[PDB]
Amino acid sequence: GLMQFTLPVRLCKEIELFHFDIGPFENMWPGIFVYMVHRSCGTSCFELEKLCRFIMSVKKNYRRVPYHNWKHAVTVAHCMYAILQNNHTLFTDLERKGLLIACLCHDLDHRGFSNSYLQKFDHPLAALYSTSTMEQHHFSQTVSILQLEGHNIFSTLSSSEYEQVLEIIRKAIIATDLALYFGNRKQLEEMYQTGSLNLNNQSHRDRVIGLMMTACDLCSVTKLWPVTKLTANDIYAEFWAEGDEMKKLGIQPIPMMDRDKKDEVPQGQLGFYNAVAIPCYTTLTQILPPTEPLLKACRDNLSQWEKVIRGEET
């Protein structure tokens, strides 16, 4: 109760900033997450014995893959922390509770392959979940861990409150299926520009939370350039692994996943910032103005990719 987590001065200052990197020391990541929960939600939101148990069970069900790993999970949770701390009054006590948990859990038991590879491999999960295959699995995995002995971090919530937070977490996790982002953003774009957007409307909150979930999921493009550049090595390691597997199925993979076409990466990253990232952070800054640093940092990294193509960098 009166046991408060403290970080060293640099982490304690840097952690409030959107572009914060959680560093290479795994054993500090759980304490970084508990520190963020206590500050976002309160020191009384969760029982520390159950939280710590939940956090280590979630860790254990993240696989040792180049990108979609325990580190990604805590990085996406930190972005959400940054957004919630800069939009203090606009979110309920349940939403703060659920959105940090959702972010930690959003890629549970990820194997490093897209929903498409699962469908073409004819994976059992692709028979069980027709769309957002992995994301339905990540939620399933979350509920399993919440149903483990001494892992129910929402024990103090009522029947109705429990159902509401699990519904927040479910929509939040489904929303990280990028294929749904495009329509979600376009609809948010139209609602903001006509003035019909209303945060008292639940279906509108759902959409805004979904865009926050995309923004947190992509926050690798909103770090300082040295971190963005090095993260990209981890992303393409999975993509090219997936391409190799497509070639084993007898399918020529998209260039993005073809390691023979790695020379086309800088221009590929250019496309992704224009088609996905900039649009995403633009609409987010429109709806939630204090999230502007994410746009600025994204814009800065777009410019760094342009310099790579021009041959000013390697």
Ligand X SMILES: Cn1ncc(C(=O)O)c1C(=O)Nc1ccn2cc(-c3ccccc3)nc2n1
Catalytic center residues: 68
Query: Counting Cβ atoms within 10 Å, is residue 308 exposed (0-12), middle (13-18) or buried (19+)?
Result: middle
Binding marks (x or -) toward Mg ion, 268..287, rule CB under 5 A? --------------------
Backbone angles phi and psi of 269, in degrees to 5: -65, -40
In the bound state with Mg ion, the residue whose beta carbon lies nearer, of 95 and 238, is 238
Cβ at position 234, least distance to Zn ion in Å? 12
Binding marks (x or -) toward Mg ion, 172..191, rule CB under 5 A? ----x---------------
* Dihedral sign, Cα of residue 35, residue 40, residue 44, residue 50: negative
Distance of alpha carbon 82 from alpha carbon 96, whole angstroms = 12
Q: By CB under 6 A, is residue 182 in contact with ligand X? A: no
Binding marks (x or -) toward ligand X, 246..285, rule CB under 6 A? ---------xx----x--xx--xx-xx-------------
Distance of alpha carbon 207 from alpha carbon 212, whole angstroms = 9
Cβ at position 49, least distance to ligand X in Å? 35
Instruction: Answer yes or no: is 263 a known binding residue.
Output: no
User: Do residues 30 and 53 touch, judged by C-beta distance below 8 A?
Assistant: no
Question: DSSP class of residue 91?
Answer: S
Instruction: Answer yes or no: is 93 a known binding residue.
Output: no
Cβ at position 209, least distance to ligand X in Å? 19
Q: By CB under 6 A, is residue 32 in contact with ligand X? A: no
Query: What's the Rg (C-alpha) of the chain?
Result: 19
Reduced to 3 states (helix: H, G, I; strand: E, B; else coil), residue 109 is: coil
Distance of alpha carbon 132 from alpha carbon 280, whole angstroms = 19
In the bound state with ligand X, the residue whose beta carbon lies nearer, of 220 and 283, is 220
Question: DSSP class of residue 254?
Answer: P
* Dihedral sign, Cα of residue 147, residue 151, residue 157, residue 163: negative
Site for Zn ion in 210-249 (CB under 5 A): 217
Instruction: Answer yes or no: is 217 a known binding residue.
Output: yes
Q: Mention every residue, 6+ apart, whose C-beta is less than 8 A from residue 245.
A: 113, 117, 121
Which residue's C-beta sits nearest to Mg ion?
A: 107
Q: Which residues bind Mg ion (CB under 5 A)?
A: 107, 176
Q: Which residues bind ligand X (CB under 6 A)?
A: 178, 218, 220-221, 232, 235, 255-256, 261, 264-265, 268-269, 271-272
Binding-site residues for 3',5'-cyclic AMP? 68, 269
Binding-site residues for a divalent metal cation? 72, 106-107, 217
Binding-site residues? 68, 72, 106-107, 217, 269
